[PDB]
């Protein structure tokens, strides 16, 4: 029994990492701007 294995995707959002989650965090995101 291994700890890390190839199997995927599981019935959880912890496989296939979306790379498009970059443009919303450069524009449609107000920070605390640094209360």
């Amino acid at each position: 029994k291994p700890i890390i294995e190839r199997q995927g995707e599981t019935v959880d959002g912890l496989t296939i990492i979306d790379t498009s989650i970059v443009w919303p965090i450069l524009c449609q995101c107000t920070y605390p701007l640094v209360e």
Partner: protein, 49 residues
């Protein structure tokens, strides 16, 4: 006859209290030009010097 102390400062007339500046203390204090971004509520009260 009876003057305790005299001194020199900034004229409270050319630098009017209405626009740009205020003088109640010796320091010419304006409100908001350089406020520290991420601090508590009581801070930035010295950065107005």
């Amino acid at each position: 006859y009876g003057a305790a102390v005299v001194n020199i400062d900034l004229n409270r007339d050319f630098f009017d209290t209405a626009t740009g500046i205020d003088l109640t203390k010796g320091i010419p204090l304006v409100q908001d030009l350089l406020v520290p971004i991420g601090v508590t509520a009581g801070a930035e009260q010295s950065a107005e010097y």
